[PDB]
Amino acid sequence: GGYMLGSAMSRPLIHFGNDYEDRYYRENMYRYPNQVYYRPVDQYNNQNSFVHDCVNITVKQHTVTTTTKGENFTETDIKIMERVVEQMCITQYQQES
Ligand SMILES: [Cl-]
Ligand code: NA
Ligand code: NA
């Protein structure tokens, strides 16, 4: 029946340990989501399980929306996107709980 779609937020500040990824996130920040998709929080007993699904669903949605427009993500984009989305999913879980 579809998923819950969180409110847009400022893309998070993340100090990536890989220096090149750290720079790449800043250079290309607008490529990544600023909103997450999820199943309702009360369907989970813990944060980690929620976040796991929230990351998978959000990355799936974002990649599908992008590919159908004839655009592409790099391998670096995917690594950064997963981290960005994980942080926003954690935020969403803590906020919505
Ligand atoms: Cl932003
Ligand atoms: Na480093
Ligand atoms: Na594509």
Author numbering: 126 to 222
What's the publication's text?
Pathogenesis in prion disease involves refolding of the host protein, PrP, from the monomeric, primarily α-helical cellular form (PrPC) to a β-sheet enriched, aggregated infectious form (PrPSc). Additionally we found that rabbits, a species with low susceptibility to prion disease possess PrP with a helix-capping motif in the β2−α2 loop, which appears to hamper the formation of the β-state. In the previously determined structure of wild-type rabbit PrPC 121–230, the sidechain of S174 forms a hydrogen bond with the backbone of N171 and vice versa, creating a hydrophobic staple helix cap motif. To test this hypothesis, we introduced the single mutations S170N and S174N as well as the double mutation S170N/S174N into rabbit PrPC 121–230, successively changing the rabbit sequence in the β2−α2 loop to that of wild-type hamster PrPC.
The structures of the S170N, S174N and S170N/S174N mutants of rabbit PrPC 121–230 were solved by x-ray crystallography to resolutions of 1.4 Å, 1.6 Å and 1.5 Å, respectively. In wild-type rabbit PrP, the side chain carbonyl oxygen of N171 hydrogen bonds to the backbone amide of S174 and the side chain hydroxyl of S174 interacts with the backbone carbonyl oxygen of N171. These reciprocal interactions, flanked by the hydrophobic interactions of Y169 and F175, form the basis for the hydrophobic staple helix-cap. The electron density surrounding the N170 sidechain is fairly weak suggesting it may be disordered. The sidechain amide and backbone carbonyl of N171 can hydrogen bond with the sidechain hydroxyl oxygen and backbone amide of S174, respectively. The S170N single mutation reduced the rabbit PrPC ΔG of unfolding to 5.9 kJ/mol, while the S174N change and the S170N/S174N double mutant displayed ΔGs of 5.45 and 5.7 kJ/mol, respectively. At pH 5.0, no β-state forms in the S170N mutant, whereas the S174N rabbit PrP begins to form the β-state to a maximum of 12.6% and the S170N/S174N double mutant forms a maximum of 37%. At pH 4.5, the S170N and S174N single mutants form 54% and 66.6% β-state and the double mutant sees a larger increase to 84.9% β-state. Under conditions that promote β-state formation, amino acid changes in the S170N, S174N and S170N/S174N mutants of rabbit PrPC cause successive increases in the population of the β-state at equilibrium, whereas the reverse mutations in hamster PrP (N170S, N174S and N170S/N174S) cause successive decreases in β-state population.
